[PDB]
Write a protein that binds this ligand. Structure first.
Ligand SMILES: [Zn+2]
Lengths: 49, 397, 397, 397, 397, 133
């Protein structure tokens, strides 16, 4: 359970892992699951709270 | 460095323990460690090489965890593990080579490659596992500021020297008194010679001394002291001190008289042995002082007496020698001994990839020069590269 | 072979870690391994021996499992465990001796004893455990066709050879030029001599070369090179090349001139050292070429000039020597070294049980011949017997 | 002894495995062992020292158990463990020194120090962990009276003795014949000399024998046998047998003839080698018998016929020789050797703390005297102190 | 060490901040620290002394907490605080002396006194406060293996040495060339003298050199360099090198030309100054090389021509000097200097209580011997004792 | 200049006061000052060096505030604070070196490095602390 809980939570659909604000114009990414989304796949380059 | 050692240790343990048919209870902890390593390394990017001929390599980690639910491992599990193990081993190999080939005149003990600098970060501290090898444990002890010790079998503590000193001398080199010596690796051979056999010396005794200082303090050393210098007991044609000419040395060997061997620390006698040959122990020393006398035989049979006349023509030259071999020792600083292959690994990597000579080490990692001028920065860099060499040798053979 | 190693390893762990008073959390996994070993071996019959004077012994396995319901194991647990450990250790002993005393020209890697053939069955694979030893590691690697590495302290790589070449000679043997050499174990000791002291040679320099080809490629080797050959520096009476007569060798030693020691790999020069002595590193090589020169001293004091006349009678013979010792090295193949005892164990078992000479190994496991002609079949059989000998030594002294 | 070893092993594992960031599953078993140790040792009081200059020290134990409720170890956990580890390590160091510096004529195998006697109680048996080390394994085997075995590289089994025997001699020392040997550490060099060069001997052959009985039985020993005695092949002036005069020895080296090396046990030839030099194997022996011959060359060139006349003025003295080195061996008893450092550690502690000469060991732990008279009591005490020194070395370097 | 410093700092801040009439808002935090100190120390027994003439004293802490209900301190509050502080300060003083009078070859930085060992436990970490002073700051830095630095005014880096080296001399010492020097504390005075005033020298210039290697690396040093050595500019009668006789020195001073001061680190010229006097800066060095020349004046007035003839009788001897003082410097190691009293305090304690000579420091804390052989163990012990001395000086006036 | 001295003073106090085992009452004020410094510096970018052989280095401040402990701060707290302290100390070192290696014939009192010029702005004045040296 401890090794697979990260994956189970990520697979969940009613919650996200966080929100990057970034205060700048970022092009919406194009994904199969949805035409355009503000999907961030990693928090690299941003201070985390 | 601790993270790098943990990576190599985990990979070696995976190679040794993840085998077909083994109970999973045998490798449960190992697989937890392996999964932790994979999780920590996932999503990070590394670069290695770029110095000398070492290729620039890029490493990315997007591996999947290992199963934890079988009772006995099968072939599928072994192959799935081995595919990841190969990549991790290659990454560790290249990181170790990148660290070895580099050096720094300031803070040589700190990581020098960018990959190891990245591994120094806190995020990677989750990969620590075990620190049980000699070099890693000495590294950790030194960082904790405790006593360290490396045990050496035949330590190369003596810079290679082969030379003589003439206390009495003439241009013709017909009537000489002095000493000759070879200090090499872990052995000292010294031979005091007198051509007149102390005919005119006070009490027919000629005193000889030989002082060998070490670049580092050796502790709990086992030593073999024997009463003859076999290297200086045959006819020789040596070249003069300034190289102008050549002189002859036709030794005849006598027993060394009043043999005293003193092991000194900070200029004070820590151990002292008188007329005792065989195995001796020097507990703590940084200088070896050997004193020995050529005593003219008071009684001689005619065959002996004919050798040593009282006039200048001297065809046989009375020589007395000692041989001292450091079989084993313990030192706080890293050295090169006859049993370990760390110096060989570092030198081999540097030569293979044609690393340009740096600001610290001598060309070709010449051990004679290194131990001659064993400085603080050199010691730090040497310990770092030897630790990395041990980490790499855990995996590469 | 892996199953045999695992039986020995689990028995060693049981004999080390099952001691009265120890917490059961210290031996949980080990006891799981031990119980699996017992379950697998139970209901099996093995037969060992029947070769030479090795007794024919039968092994029936029927043992109860070790208990698991205990916090700190007590005297009863230790006794019940040791009674089984003794039998298993004896069985492993005899299996290993049976394996060691056998050889096969074809498939020398395949198990030879019928007990090991049985253990090769897939039913016993569940006992595999962890293959952490160096020899078992290399066994697995060479099974997979991966790189193998054995680290040796002064490996026994040179077949014994004490000989001399006479480049110039005549029946009187009073004006001789050439070389003497002793290769043995890890030491080459060569000495080029000239009776005329290069009086009539161009530039008054005589060239000597010595090529020693190893049967296997050594890597990352530390080598001690010294400028004198103490073995060929005293008067000798050597029997002629054809044993017809004897000739006198009365040497006087000069420093070797233009020393070049180069380590070659398939004819290409991988390493080379010019007039450098002490500790040196050969990264990858299979041949050693030592070139040196007797240079007649341009200037001589009278005591030296007397030694080398212009005419024929040469009472003293100029000699220049080198000594080379491989202190440590790495080899892909299995070898005999100073520290290890695998050759000794194999030879001891064969001699003790009077094993008839087979087709592969030379009589009495003569290492000189075994390494002089190190054929692939000999390498396979030697690796097998050395691996099984290490497995055995893991339990028996 | 077993409990002290367990304390040292637990502390070494604590220092190696309890590191920041490590997974708790990597340490859980060790933490259970460590808490067991704390529970057992709490509330007991120990006293060490008081012999020689070794300071008196009092040890009190009141420590809290290490936690077991973390996923990855953090700085807090490591800091909490480190203080306990340091105190325990100091305690183990002092106990080991106090036990090493003591000895007893009767029951030398039994613990001698108050701390170790206290630890020998039954309440302390709960900490045993695992007796993996070689010395503790042989300790347990010897307590059970099973067969022990220590592997040595270059074992020190021959007490240093340089001597000579004269089978033929006269006051003038012009026509000597006999043998001349050095036995030291692991090497035997024996030269048989004849001034007349077997001119009048039967069949022109002079026989030479040299018997070296070992104090203990050596097993599966690898030997190096070479056909010259380099130590005894140069001119020497040697004191006469009674020390009242000196004689001259001017050797000329011939090949030893009909060399026969026998390794004997209980007077029965176990291994016999004829005219075979290099690496040989002696499976089990307690005496070494070297037989060789000086054969006058049947045919001589003029330069040799001149050397060997018929009359008394013999200027060159024919000499044959043999060298025998024990590269690696196995012994049931404990011994000093080149690789290890236990004798050096024991001698170092005694010298540092000025331990008075006791009733068992010779002053200064003189290995020559010890091995020369290696009594059963000395063997017991030496095994005890060596085992304690190994336990100590697990923690102190 | 940190806990001892924290105790001292709390007591000092109490003796200075807790004064009658002061607002409780000025001392609230200090009183919280004081109460925690009392709570942590309560119920603990300590013993100090027992070495040399230092009396054995016992300390028991059962104290009440300082009050916290007052808005201003009055006489009674200060009185009770002083009553507690006196006992705590006496305990700190005795702990510091007990620690200062002790040494250890191994683990020199580790606590040596029983009191400091007890304080090193984890229960006493609760009282740590702020480590602001220079010596405790460097203690923590070196504990974490950071870059330490001590700032010295006139560091005592040169051992006392007053000597001379002759390059030209005779039995009559009436025509000498060479150098004389005094190295003392932070000052080097070197004077090269030539009796012939370079009458026959090539270009009428006589070169002089002086190499002073420092035992530790100094950094950012301000150095005053003046062109004359006042110490070697008056007539002298000096013992000859062997001591058999005495020679006369009658200097006459000329200006040194081509003055070159080179500060080197590991044989690499880091700073160089030519013909520069006054305040210069050496950023990083461990060797000083002074080169200066005596040039015979090309033009002389009659009173100088009389002084400098070309015939042998040389009544007045040309002399050229340099003075070099290290006004201030920074060193990673600890040294005695002119502004700090730490060495004086340590020596005073040892002399007052007649501490027997130990195995690390020279007798009487002789700074000449300490710096001459400043081994790493001596540096560790010296840093520990200097830190304890500073802690003591915080309180004891 | 005062801002640079205040950064140095607060870093020195953090190094010499935030030590394992000390009471939190001993460093409450220091931690408040440290967190004020972190808040003010966060989001600002600095560039140092570029004269002679002094390397050009870029500094970005993205740090969390120091936490609290009820009674005595422990090893974890010290390590977490030490990371940020090390980064800030490196930054101040480089700013001071870049100031030392520069000079101006006119307005020699004025800051000469871009880092010190930025720090002289009004936003950083909240980092002042005590000017005791
Ligand atoms: Zn060896």
């Amino acid at each position: 359970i401890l090794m697979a809980m990260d994956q189970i939570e990520r697979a969940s659909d009613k919650i996200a892992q966080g929100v990057i604000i970034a205060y700048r114009d970022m092009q919406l990414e194009r994904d199969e699951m949805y035409g355009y989304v503000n999907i961030a796949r990693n928090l690299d380059g941003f201070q985390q709270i | 460095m601790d993270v790098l050692y943990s990576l190599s240790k985990t990979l070696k343990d995976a190679r040794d323990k993840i085998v077909e048919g083994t109970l999973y209870s045998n490798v449960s902890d190992l697989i937890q460690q392996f999964n932790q390593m994979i999780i920590t390394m996932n999503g990070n990017e590394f670069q290695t090489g770029g110095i000398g001929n070492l290729p620039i390599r890029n490493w990315n980690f997007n591996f999947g965890l290992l199963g934890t639910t079988l009772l006995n491992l099968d072939a599928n599990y072994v192959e799935t593990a081995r595919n990841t193990i190969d990549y991790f081993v290659d990454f560790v190999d290249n990181v170790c080579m990148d660290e070895m080939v580099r050096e720094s005149q300031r803070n040589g003990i700190a990581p020098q490659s960018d990959s190891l600098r990245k591994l120094s970060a806190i995020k990677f501290k989750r990969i620590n596992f075990d620190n049980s090898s000699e070099y890693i444990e000495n590294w950790n002890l030194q960082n904790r500021r405790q006593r360290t010790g490396f045990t050496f079998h035949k330590p190369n503590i003596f810079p290679y020297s082969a030379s003589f000193t003439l206390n009495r001398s003439q241009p013709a080199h017909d009537n000489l008194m002095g000493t000759m010596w070879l200090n090499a690796g872990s052995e000292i051979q010294v031979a005091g010679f007198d051509y007149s056999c102390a005919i005119n010396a006070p009490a027919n005794i000629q005193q000889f001394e030989h002082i060998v200082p070490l670049r580092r303090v050796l502790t709990t050393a086992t030593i073999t002291l024997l009463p003859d210098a076999e290297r200086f007991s045959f006819p020789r044609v040596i070249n003069s001190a300034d190289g102008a000419t050549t002189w002859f040395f036709n030794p005849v060997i006598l027993r060394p008289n009043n043999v005293e061997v003193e092991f000194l620390l900070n200029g004070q006698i820590i151990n002292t042995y008188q007329a005792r040959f065989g195995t001796i122990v020097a507990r703590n020393f940084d200088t070896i002082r050997l004193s020995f006398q050529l005593m003219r035989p008071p009684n001689m049979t005619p065959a002996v007496a004919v050798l040593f006349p009282n006039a200048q023509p001297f065809e046989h030259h009375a020589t007395v020698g000692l041989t001292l071999r450091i079989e084993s020792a313990v030192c706080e600083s890293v050295l090169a001994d006859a049993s370990e292959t760390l110096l060989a690994n570092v030198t081999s990597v540097r030569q293979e990839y044609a690393i340009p000579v740096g600001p610290v080490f001598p060309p070709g990692m010449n051990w004679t020069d290194l131990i001659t001028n064993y400085s603080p920065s050199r010691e730090d860099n040497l310990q770092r590269v030897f630790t990395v060499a041990s980490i790499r040798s855990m995996l590469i053979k």
